[PDB]
Structures are given as structure tokens and as C-alpha cells.
Paper text:
Abundant filamentous inclusions of tau are characteristic of more than 20 neurodegenerative diseases that are collectively termed tauopathies. Six tau isoforms that range from 352 to 441 amino acids in length are expressed in adult human brain from a single gene by alternative mRNA splicing. Tau filaments consist of a structured core made mostly of the repeat domain, with less structured N- and C-terminal regions forming the fuzzy coat. Here, we report in vitro assembly conditions with recombinant tau that replicate the structures of filaments from both Alzheimer’s disease (AD) and chronic traumatic encephalopathy (CTE), as determined by cryo-EM.
Author numbering:
A (entry chain A), B (entry chain C), C (entry chain B), D (entry chain L), E (entry chain J), F (entry chain K), ...: 305 to 379
The structure:
């Protein structure tokens, strides 16, 4: 005398694709680099780098959440 | 005497595509770089870089949420 | 004597595409670069860069939300 | 009393680039194809094809010649 | 009393690049194909094909000749 | 009283690059294929094929000749 | 109550006659031939012939087709 | 109550006659031939012939097809 | 109540005659031939012949097809 | 004291060519011939001929005579 | 004391050419011939001929004579 | 004390060519012949001939005579 047919269907396809992806870098070339320093004074913290060709992918992001609560109640 | 059919169908395709994607960089060239520093004084914190060719993908973003509650109640 | 047919169908296509995407960079060339500094005094924090050809994709954004509450009740 | 200085310099760059080159074909999609043939008759030679998506690069050409004769004589 | 210097310099860069080259074909899709042949009759030679997605590079061409004679004579 | 300096320099760089080369085919997909044949009569030679995804590089070409004769004579 | 007579008569004399046919050549004389070649040079393909008398009959053509469907139907 | 007489008569005389046919060549004469070659040079393919008299019949052609389908149907 | 007579008569005389046929060559004469070669040079493939008289009959062609069908059908 | 040199040279080319020579008679046709004769009387010798086509070559002539004498007498 | 040099040279080319020589007769046609004779009386020798086509060559003549005498007498 | 050199040269080539020679008679046709003779009377010798086609070559002539005499007489 009561029929309950709780029959939800989920095919949802939550997707994330982040950073250097599916690319061609055929023949990249860094140039020649020279750094000359004589009588530098630093009173405080130094961060530095020197290079010619840098290729960098960082990607802090690209995360996913699925929250999917299902409830049925009767009385 | 009572029939409840609860048959929702979800095919939702939540998608994120972020950063350098599907590109051609055929023959990118960095030029020659010279840095000459003589008699410099820094009273405080220093950050620097010296490159020639830099390729960079950062992507802090591109995240997904699906929040998807399903409820049926009877009395 | 009562029939309820809760039957929503979802094919929602929530999509994000962000940054350098599907591009051709054939033969980009950075110029020759020289920096000369003699007697610079810095009283406070310094941030710098030197390069010839920089390619940068940042993308802080491009995130998605799908919020999808489904409810049925009876009495 | 006689000085001959035969000194030709050649940097000739004879180049050929032929057919589908450096292209992006993102998402080409062939249609559905049906061929129905009932009661046919062929008295002579038959050539056929049935595709949906064909990508073809032929290039019979694109060849190079450099013809470079160098002569010096004396008497 | 006679000086002959015969000093030709060749850096010639004869080059051929032929057929599908440096391309992206990201997501090419063939459609569905049906061929129905009932009551056919062929009195002479038959050639056929039935594909869905075909990718073809032929390149009969793209060949090179460098022919480059050098002569010095004296008397 | 006679000086002959026969000093030719060759750096010539005859090059051929032929066929499917440096490409990305990221996710190519052939479609479904059906061939139905009932009461076919072939009186003469038959060549056929059936497929779904074909990738073909043929390259009859792309050959090189370098022919480079050097002669010096005296009397 | 129905008489069908199908009595086609074919007497056709389809004929082809090609090349040197039904000739007299009485006393054809080739003359004296001399070729002197001193200091020749050929960078590419050579085809030659040297002779006093040639009587050459080629005939690539001269073929025949008869195509002759006959049909009778009743109901 | 039905009479079908199907009585086609074919006497057809499909004929091909090709090349040097039914000729007199009485006293054909090639003359003296001389070839002198001193200091020749060939970089690529050579085909030659040197004779006094040639009588050459080639005939790539002269073929026949007869195609002659006969059909009677009743119902 | 139904009489079918199927009496096709084929006396067809499909014929081919190719090449040097039915000829008289009474007294053909090749002359004297001389070939002198001193200081020749060949960098690639050579095909040659030297002769006084050639009587060459080639005939690549001259073939026949007869292709015939006879259908009688009743119901 | 006496020299006699009797040294005649005879190259004489005495030649005869008579009758049906070097012809083509291709398709010569004699017509129908009929003779009817009821009650004829012949009182003397009869010579008679009937026929459709005649190709008579008779040649009672065409002969050669060479009458030659060589005499040396001395005293 | 005496020299006799009797040295005649004879190149004499005595030639005859008579009758049907070097012709083409293509398609010569004789007509229909009919002869009817009731009650003729012949009181004398009969020579008679009936026919449609004749190609008679007779040549009673065309002969050659060379009467040659060479005589040397001395004293 | 006396020298006799009797040294005649004979290369004379007495030649005869008579009758049907070097012809083609390709497709010569004699027609139909019929002769009818009811109540004919012949009172003397009869010579008679009937036939469709005749190709008579008779040649009573065409002969050669070479009468040659050599005499040397001395005293």
C-alpha cells in the first residue's frame, strides 16, 4: 500500500587538468648569460638565481571536492 | 495506494582546464644577457633573478566543487 | 491512488578554459640585454628580474562550483 | 708578380616546407555515414572509398637542386 | 712569382621538410559507418576501402640534389 | 716561383625530413564500422580493406644525392 | 493467348587495323653517320640513340569494345 | 496460353590487327655508323644505343573486350 | 499452359593479331658499326647496346576478354 | 727490254627484270560468270575457256647475252 | 726500252625492267558476265574466251646484249 | 729480256629475274562460274577449260649466255 523506489543514478565526471599539458616545445634555446659583481654589500637576507633556459610548472591549485549526501526517511 | 519513484539522473561534466595547454612553441630564442654591478649597497632584503629564456606556468586556480544533496521524506 | 515520479535529468556542462591555450608561437626572439649599475644605495626591500624572452601564464581564477540540492516531501 | 685569390663564400639556404605544417586541428568530427547499394552491375574497373573523417597530406613535390660549378684557369 | 690561392668556403644548407609536420590533432573523431551491399556484380577489377577515421601522409617528393664541381688548371 | 694553395672548405649540410614528424595526436578515436554483403559476384581481381582508425606514413621519397668532384691540373 | 518471339540477329564486323600495313618499301638506304664528342659533361639523366635507318611501328592504340546487354521481361 | 521464344543469334566478328602487317621490305640498307667519345662525364643515369638498321614493332595496344549479358524473366 | 524456349546461339569469332605478321623481308642489311670510347666516366647506372641489325617484335598487348551471362528466372 | 701489262678490269652489271614483280594485288574480285548454249554446231577445231579471275604472267623474253673476247698477240 | 699498259675499266650497268612492276592494285572489280547462244553455226576454227577480270602481263621483249672485245697487237 | 703480264679481271655479274616474284596477292577472289550446254555438236578436236581463279606464270624466256675467250700468243 506504500511503494518507495529510491533509485538516483550518478555518472557525474568532476575533472581538473592543470599546468603545462599536451604542449610541444620543439627547439627552445636559452641565450648566453654573464653576471659580474665587484664590491656589493648586503645588510640583510638575499634570495637569487641565475640561468639561461628555465621551464617551470608550479600548480598549487587544480583540487576537487565532491560532497554527495543521500537521505531517505519514513514515519 | 501510494507510489513514490525517486529516479534523478546526473551526467554533469564539471571540467577545469588551466595553464599552458595544447600549445606549439616551435623555436623560441633567448637573447644574450649581461649584468654588471660594481659598488652597490643594500640596507634591506633582496630578491632577484637573471635568465635569458623563461617559460612559466603558475596556476593557483582551476579547482572544482560539486555539492549535491538528495533528500526524500515521508509522513 | 497517488503516483509521484521525481525524474530530473542533468547533463550540465560546467566548463573552464584559462591561460595560453591552443596557440602557435613560431619563432619569438628576445633581444640582447645589458644592465650596468655603479653606485646604487637601497635603503629598503628590493625585488627585481632581468631576462630576454619571458613566457608566463598565471591563472589564479578559472575555478568552478555546481551546487545542486534535490528535495521531495510527502504528508 | 701575379697573385690570384679565388675566395667565394656560400651560405645559401635552399629550403622546402610542404604539406600540413604547424597546424592545430582541435576537435574535427566526422558525421555518421550510410551507404546502401541494392542491385548494381559494373562492366568495367571500379575504385571506391567510404570514410567519415579523412586527413590526407600528399606532397609529390617539394624537392630541391643546388647546381654549383666553380672554375679557375691560368695561361 | 705566381701565387694561386683557391679557398672557396661552402656552408650551404640544402633542406627539405615534407608531410604532416609539427601539428597538433587534439581529439579528432570518426563517425559511425555502415555499408550494406545486396546483389552487386563486377565484371572487372575492384579496389575499395571502408574506414571511419583515416590519417595519411604520402610524400613521394622532398628529395635533394647538391652537385658541386671545383676545377683549377694551370699552364 | 709557382705556389698553388688548393684549400676548398665544405660544411654543406644536405638534409631531408619526411613523413609524420614531431606531431601530437592526443586522443584520436575511430567510429564503429559495419559492412554487410549478400549476393556479390566478382568476375575479376578484388583488393579491399575495412578499418576504424588508420594512421599511415608512406614516404617513397626524401632521398639525397651529393656529388662533388674536385680537380687540380698543372703543366 | 500470348506469343513473344525475341529473335535479334547480330552480324556486326567490328574491326581495327593499325600501324604499317600493306606496304612496299623497295630499297630504303640510311646514309653514313658520324658522331664525335670531345669534352662533354652531363649533370642529369641522358637518353640517346645513334643510327642509320629506323623502321619503327609503335601502336599503343587500336583496341575494341563490344558491350551488348539483352533483356526480356514478363508479368 | 503463354509462349516465350528467346532466340538471339550472334555471328559478330570482333577483330584486331596491329603492327607491321602484310608488308614487303625488299632490300633495306643501314649505312656505316661511327661514334667517337673522348673525355665525357655522366653524373646521372645513361641509356643509349648505337646501330645501323632497326625494324622494331612495339604494339602495347590492340586488345579486345566483348561483354554480352542475356536475361529473361517471368512472373 | 506456359512454354519457355531459351535458344540463344553464339557463333561470335573474337580475334586478335599483333606484331610482325605476314611480312616479307627480302635482304635487309646492317652496315659496319664502330664505337671508340677513350676516357669516359659514369657516376650512375648505364644501359647500352651496339649492333648492326635489330628485328625486334615486342607485343605487350593483344589480349582478349569475353565475358558472358545467361539468366532465366521463373515464379 | 719490253714490258707488256694487259690488265683490263670488268665490273659490268648486266641485269634483266621481267614480269609481275614487287606488286601488291590486295583484293581483286572476279564477278559471277555464266554461259548458256542450246543447239550450236562447230564444223572445225574448237579452243574454249571460261573463268572469273585471271592473273597471267607470260614472259617469253627477258634473256641476256654477254659475248666477251680478250686477245694479246706479240711479234 | 718499251712499256705497254693496257688498262681499260668497265663499269657498264646494262639494265632492263619490263611488265607489271612495283604497283598497288587495291580493289579492282570485274562485273557480272552472262553469255546466251541459241542456234549459232561455226564453219571455221573457233578460239573463244569468257571471263570477268584479267590482269595479263606479256613481255615478249626486254632482253639485253653486251658484245665486248679487247685486243692488243704488237710489232 | 721480255716481260708479259696477262692479268685480266672479271667481276661481271650477268643476272636474270623473270616471272611472279616478290608480290603479295592478299585476298584475290574468283566469283561463281556455271556453264550449260543442251544439244551442242562438235565435228573435230575440242580443247576446253572451266575454273573460278587462275594464277599462271609461264616464263619460256629468262635464260643467260656468257661466251668468254682468253688468248695469249707469242713469237
Amino acid at each position: 500500500s506504500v511503494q518507495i523506489v529510491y533509485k538516483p543514478v550518478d555518472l557525474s565526471k568532476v575533472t581538473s587538468k592543470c599546468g603545462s599539458l599536451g604542449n610541444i616545445h620543439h627547439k627552445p634555446g636559452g641565450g648566453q648569460v654573464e653576471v659580474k659583481s665587484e664590491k656589493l654589500d648586503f645588510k640583510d637576507r638575499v634570495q637569487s638565481k641565475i640561468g639561461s633556459l628555465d621551464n617551470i610548472t608550479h600548480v598549487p591549485g587544480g583540487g576537487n571536492k565532491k560532497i554527495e549526501t543521500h537521505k531517505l526517511t519514513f514515519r
